[PDB]
């Protein structure tokens, strides 16, 4: 039996700090038909060839997708330290993974366009001695997710719960919608096969 990539083809893709994760097990997947629906701009895979990803039996498959501008590709790379890799999303390289940056074409009408591209610029605790920053675990969520869920109306707007403080940066989306996918494979490994 196969599995549907329809949940990632409907609705408005979430922002980077609130990315959406799909887990697939015991499915006959077709990756060649998924990337054909997008205008793939970048495909960089670690510990697996881009062609080698499409074939082979894995124990589990994971897809973390969010809305992310392609010109910010340099801030999502390994070895780069910044707000994106610390307060928003830190890729886990323990398992074979690939990162895809693709632009949604006009044909895809089931994907709604979010009003703005948004991310976090800081997430910390405050004390008389300064700021104690909080950093994401590889593949995990920011501790300031509950505060960020209130939404940001302007750039560098901050939300505070008395202990945690978070700041958000937003900017309007121009043209088509640019999306980011992180595909991780985990190795019984006969569950998920092409």
């Amino acid at each position: 039996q196969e599995c549907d990539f329809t949940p990632m083809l409907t609705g408005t893709p979430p922002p980077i700090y609130n990315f959406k994760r799909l887990v697939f097990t015991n499915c006959n997947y077709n990756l060649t038909k998924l990337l054909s629906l997008f205008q793939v701009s970048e495909f960089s895979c670690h510990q697996v060839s881009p062609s080698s990803l499409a074939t082979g039996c894995y124990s589990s498959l994971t897809v973390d997708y969010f809305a992310y501008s392609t010109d910010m590709s340099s801030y999502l790379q390994p070895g780069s330290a910044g707000e994106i890799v610390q307060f928003n999303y830190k890729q886990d390289f323990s398992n074979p993974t690939c990162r895809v940056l693709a632009t949604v074409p006009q044909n895809l009408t089931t994907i709604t366009k979010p009003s703005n591209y948004a991310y976090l610029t800081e997430c910390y605790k405050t004390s008389a001695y300064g700021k104690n920053y909080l950093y994401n675990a590889p593949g995990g969520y920011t501790p300031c997710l509950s505060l960020a869920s209130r939404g940001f109306s302007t750039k560098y707007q901050s939300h505070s719960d008395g202990e945690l403080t978070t700041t958000g940066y937003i900017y309007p989306v121009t043209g088509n919608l640019q999306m980011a996918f992180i595909i991780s494979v985990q190795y019984d490994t006969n569950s998920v096969c092409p």
Binding site: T121, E122, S127, A128, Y156
Partner: protein, 584 residues
């Protein structure tokens, strides 16, 4: 306890300040890059909100006596809030002081000097300064010099006399001896063993540093005088002081403009890469990405995406009015920007690195408490900025980038010309700064009575700087008030220390990079070890004594002029042979 209450008060102060300061800074930025009436009024309302909050919070910090505070950081932040300042004056005197300050600033800003023989030709400050910076005629410079001295500075004497007494009254109200002591207190710290510094100790420190530096200035002064004697025959004595109006600028602050008549050999052509930059199709974005690449090569972080999206790097094409002055902005909540209208030239190439050095220093201590996000003292930020432009300007860096051909030939003549130009810019201004601050300190203290302000001033001008006035000036004149920093109430010692520190940093960064040969040929690029020990000092902010921060990088607690003399060793050795026995 009192310390726990101080800690929670500071926690809530930080919480509110982090929002109010960014709002004020954003309003100011929106005004500066887009000049209009609405932007000005929004800037004013944001500034008023911040000022009211800060005053109401400072009224609360007075309830925590510092004798019961032990932590060196809570006490440090409470010392900043508890300051009174001009609020110690008796209501009427504060308004009178504000009126005097505005009157002096307006009088300076509205200078106007007319030609004695051509009354139709009247020049403002800018067109008058352009005359001094390019003229080569004795009387044409002399009438400009005397006119500016007797037009703007002559009417600031009655205001300056009252300014001195009101500033002394408020400083004595702030538990100081005088206003010069108030200014000197910016260098005072507390420490355990040798990390403490006094405001009664800066005077002798700068005195001994100037005594160390004076033998180089004597050689440079003798060389410049020997060349000027040929430039202006029959007006300069073979062994006398240099006339005041012939030293390039209005006040003789910098001797750079003398380079054209002081260059050792006109045959040797200076390095210029503006033509190559235009030929390779460079832009503002390419210049700033090259600067970011240079700073990343030594292990410092890259720029935030908001820096690239929000900063203004070129003059707008929409015709918006912009205050075009190169500035670096730390607006608050992880928001760093640069405002400069760049062109494709070498000077802009160096200023990009300077401003990015400012930005990197700002990014370093971004996690400190609000009141402790500054340099260790007033000279650290500019020294850090300039120590990068020191390394960038080297032909080794340009050759590595490819901005000049790899077949470029480096001979000792070019090294001597480069060192001489730098000494004209750098060494030639230290005596001016030293004597100006010394005169101000003596005036505020009271060692110079009001009846002999000029008699002493020019006297010092002949003993420290070696400069003689062209015309006698009575006590109706106030020549030092003719300067910007004097009429506009600015401290001037910042420029004396920020040079002494500068080279003290550079040598420390060239010993760690394992540099071989002369110090002026040192490039710290592709050296993560130098960046590590640099960021060790940059991360401290204002939380430590500036002596501890100085030791973190330069491995010394005391400012020394030996690195500055070591930088200019080849020039000194050449100048000694050129002058012979003419020094004096």
């Amino acid at each position: 306890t009192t310390e726990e209450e101080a800690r929670r008060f500071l926690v809530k102060f930080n919480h509110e300040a982090e929002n109010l300061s960014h709002e004020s800074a954003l309003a100011s930025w929106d005004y500066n890059t887009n000049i209009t009436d609405e932007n000005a009024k929004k800037m004013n309302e944001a500034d008023n909100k911040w000022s009211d909050f800060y005053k109401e919070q400072s009224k609360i910090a007075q309830g925590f006596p510092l004798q019961e505070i032990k932590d060196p950081i809570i006490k440090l932040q409470l010392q900043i809030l508890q300051q009174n300042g001009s609020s110690v004056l008796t209501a009427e005197k504060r308004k009178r002081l504000s009126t005097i300050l505005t009157t002096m600033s307006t009088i300076y800003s509205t200078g106007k000097v007319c030609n004695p023989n051509n009354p139709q030709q009247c020049f403002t400050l800018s067109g008058l300064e352009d005359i001094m910076e390019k003229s080569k005629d004795y009387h044409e410079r002399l009438w400009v010099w005397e006119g500016w001295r007797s037009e703007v500075g002559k009417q600031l004497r009655p205001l300056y006399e009252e300014y001195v007494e009101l500033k002394n009254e408020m400083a004595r109200g702030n538990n100081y001896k005088d206003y010069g002591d108030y200014w000197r207190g910016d260098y005072e710290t507390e420490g355990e063993k040798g990390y403490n510094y006094s405001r009664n100790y800066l005077m002798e420190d700068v005195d001994r540093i100037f005594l160390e530096i004076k033998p180089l200035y004597e050689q440079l002064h003798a060389y410049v005088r020997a060349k000027l004697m040929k430039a202006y025959p029959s007006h300069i004595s073979p062994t006398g002081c240099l006339p005041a109006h012939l030293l390039g600028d209005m006040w003789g602050r910098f001797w750079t403009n003398l380079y054209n008549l002081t260059v050792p050999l006109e045959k040797e052509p200076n390095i210029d890469v503006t033509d190559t930059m235009k030929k390779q199709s460079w832009d503002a974005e390419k210049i700033f990405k090259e600067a970011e690449k240079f700073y990343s090569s030594v292990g410092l972080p890259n720029m935030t995406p908001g820096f690239w999206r929000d900063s203004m790097l070129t003059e707008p094409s929409d015709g918006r009015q912009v205050v075009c002055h190169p500035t670096a902005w730390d607006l608050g909540k992880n928001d760093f920007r640069i405002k400069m209208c760049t062109k494709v030239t070498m000077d802009d190439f160096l200023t990009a690195h300077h401003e990015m050095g400012h930005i990197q220093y700002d990014m370093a201590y971004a996690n400190q408490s609000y009141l402790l996000r500054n340099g260790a003292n007033e000279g650290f930020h500019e020294a850090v900025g300039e120590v990068m432009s020191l390394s960038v300007a080297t032909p080794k860096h340009l050759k590595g980038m490819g901005l000049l051909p790899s077949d470029f030939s480096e001979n000792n003549e070019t090294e001597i010309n480069f060192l001489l130009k730098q000494a004209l810019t750098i060494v030639g201004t230290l005596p001016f700064t030293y004597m100006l601050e010394k005169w101000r300190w003596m005036v505020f203290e009271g060692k110079i009575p009001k009846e002999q302000w000029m008699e002493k001033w020019w006297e010092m001008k002949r003993e420290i700087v070696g400069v003689v006035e062209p015309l006698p000036h009575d006590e109706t004149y106030c020549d030092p008030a003719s300067l910007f920093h004097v009429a506009n109430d600015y401290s001037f010692i910042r420029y004396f220390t920020r040079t002494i520190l500068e080279f003290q940093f550079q040598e420390a960064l060239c010993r760690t990079a394992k540099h071989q040969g002369p110090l002026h040929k040192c490039d710290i690029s592709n050296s993560t070890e130098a960046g590590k020990k640099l960021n060790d000092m940059l991360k401290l902010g204002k939380s430590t004594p500036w002596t501890y921060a100085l030791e973190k990088i330069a491995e010394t607690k005391e400012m020394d002029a030996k690195p500055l003399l070591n930088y200019f060793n080849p020039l000194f050795r050449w100048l000694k042979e050129q002058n012979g026995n003419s020094v004096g």
